[PDB]
């Protein structure tokens, strides 16, 4: 599970992150890359690649910041995964949360349902393995940090999720 | 659970099928369409429609014959689903099995690993839901009917699965 595209499959560089997430995690933070969007597996590999390159080469980070990335292709791409503390929501939220990030800018476009489906299924396949709590709370990026992420349109949608909390 | 692309999404004609399966189902039979492959949600949705069409329109079937279709786009396309008897492996096997079909021809080519991951992830969801038995048995199309399906490349692969039984 759960049709997660593994690091090696999207041509990732080697993670160098050591700091580990205490399971089971209470919080999920939903962001956007505010990068280029992609609707094929081929373009979404290329794009996940591009995100990690910025984070690693330019920002000198130990890996891509997000635990997981959602493509409009409808597949989840493995970032730091369930166990490795992210860099997506800053110091107060990074240690106590999983960050998933929709690849693209969602101010003036919604993600297609398969992307929204992928995410929800990703979230379920996280309780199952005990990475997430049963009663996990979903926060928007803007709900924990000064940012427009995850975009006006995607933010509206996640407010309607059963697990969402302001 | 499953991130399955639902009938409405690939724009599938309303099913006319009535006869049910008895849960939990013991057998999964793996086929190929022997037809044109697709590696985008866009072309793969169209392909499900094409296979549905051939089955409904040319063979006068009540619906696409497969319970589920697997795209090379890495997405499961819903057919008859977990509860409805399909038309994929003839009259001995149709009433006691789930039929999943890889959209393509896997005599010369292997399916890309995201296809193989969706298939496996699907079955696990079948078991989760109780549509499939915990001790399900995965069979080749060729293993229960005189055919080439699911093709030797794919057949080779599916023989390496833990639930596979000659
Ligand atoms: Cl970092």
Q: Is the Cβ–Cβ distance between A112 and A72 less than 8 Å?
A: yes
Q: Mind telling me how many Å the CA of A129 is from chain B's nearest CA?
A: 13
The approach used to solve this structure was X-ray
- Of B47, B39, B2, nearest to A43 (Cα)? B39
**Distance separating alpha carbons of residues B102 and B114, to the nearest angstrom:** 12
Residues B80/B39, Cβ–Cβ less than 8 Å: no
Nearest to A41 among B2, B5, B73 (CB): B73
Task: Identify from B1, B9, B45, B74 which residue to disrupt to test chain A contact, counting A C-beta atoms within 10 A and taking the largest count.
Answer: B74
Q: How many Å apart are CA B132 and CA B148, to the nearest integer?
A: 26
| CA–CA gap between residue B98 and residue B123 (Å, rounded) | 10
Buried b (16+ CB within 10 A) or exposed e, B138-157: bbbbbbebebebbbeebbeb
* Residue reference for tokens 């057998």: B27
Question: Phi then psi for A50, rounded to 5 degrees?
Answer: -60, -40
Residues 6+ apart with CB under 8 A from A125: A1, A2, A4
Query: Chain B residues with CB inside 8 Å of A74's CB?
Result: 3, 5, 41, 73-75
Question: What is the full DSSP assignment across A121-139?
Answer: HHHHHHHTTTSEEEEEEEE
Look at chain B and report how many structural domains it folds into: 1
Q: Would the CB atoms of A114 and B74 count as touching at under 8 Å?
A: no
Contact criterion met (CB < 8 Å) for B121 and A3:
yes
Dihedral angle over CA of A105, A106, A112, A115, nearest 10: 70
Ligand 1 centroid distance, CA of A40 (Å): 28
Dump the DSSP string for B93-129: TGGGEEEEEESS-TTTSPPPHHHHHHHHHHHHHHHHH
Q: How many CB atoms are located within 10 Å of the residue A36 CB?
A: 13
Give the largest Cα separation in chain A, rounded: 38
Question: Domain range for residue B137?
Answer: 1-166
CB A78 within 8 A of CB A86: no
CA A86 to ligand 1 center in whole angstroms: 7
Which chain A residue has the Cα nearest residue B115? A3
B40-71 burial by CB neighbour count: b if 16+ within 10 A, else e? bbebbbebbbbbbeebbeeeebbbbbbbbbbb
The CA distance from A53 to the nearest CA of chain B, in Å, is 23
d(CA A87, CA A67): 8
The closest alpha carbon to A123, from A135, A111, A113, belongs to A135
Cβ contact B113–A42 (<8 Å): no
**How far away is chain B from the Cα of A142, in angstroms, using its nearest Cα?**
27
Distances (CA, A) of A31 to A3, A20, A25, B7, B22: 21, 21, 17, 29, 43
What is the rounded CA–CA span in Å between residue A21 and residue A93?
11
Q: Which residues of A touch B73 (CB under 8 A)?
A: 40-41, 73-74
Query: Distance, CA B144 to ligand 1 centroid (Å)?
Result: 53
CB-nearest partner of A9 from B1, B9, B113: B113
- Please give the radius of gyration of chain A, using alpha carbons only, rounded to the nearest integer: 14
With beta carbons less than 8 A apart as the criterion, state whether A68 and A120 touch. Answer: no
The DSSP result for B3-39, as a single string, is --B-HHHHTPPPP---PBPPSSEEEEEEEE-SS----
Provide the pairing of β-strand B68-70 with B76-78: antiparallel
* Beta partners for residue A141, in sequence order: none
Phi-psi region of A60 (alpha: psi -120 to 50; beta: other; left: phi over 0): left
Q: B12 Cβ partners below 8 Å, 6+ apart?
A: B48, B49, B52, B63, B64, B78, B79
- Burial label for A126, CB within 10 Å (0-12, 13-18, 19+), is buried
């Amino acid at each position: 599970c759960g049709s997660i595209v593994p690091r090696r499959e999207w041509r990732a560089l080697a993670s160098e992150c050591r700091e580990r997430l205490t399971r089971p995690v209470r919080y999920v933070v939903v962001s956007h890359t505010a990068g280029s969007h992609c609707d094929t597996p081929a373009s979404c590999a290329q794009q996940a690649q591009n995100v990690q390159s910025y984070h690693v080469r330019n920002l000198g980070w130990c890996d891509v910041g997000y635990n997981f990335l959602i493509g409009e292709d409808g597949l989840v791409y493995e970032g730091r995964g369930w166990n490795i503390k992210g860099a997506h929501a800053g110091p107060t939220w990074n240690p106590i949360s999983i960050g998933i990030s929709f690849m693209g800018n969602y101010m003036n476009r919604v993600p297609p349902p398969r992307a929204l489906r992928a995410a929800q299924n990703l979230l379920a396949c996280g309780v199952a393995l005990g990475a997430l709590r049963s009663n996990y709370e979903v926060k928007g990026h803007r709900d924990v940090q000064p940012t427009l992420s995850p975009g006006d349109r995607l933010y509206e949608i996640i407010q309607t999720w059963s697990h969402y909390r302001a």
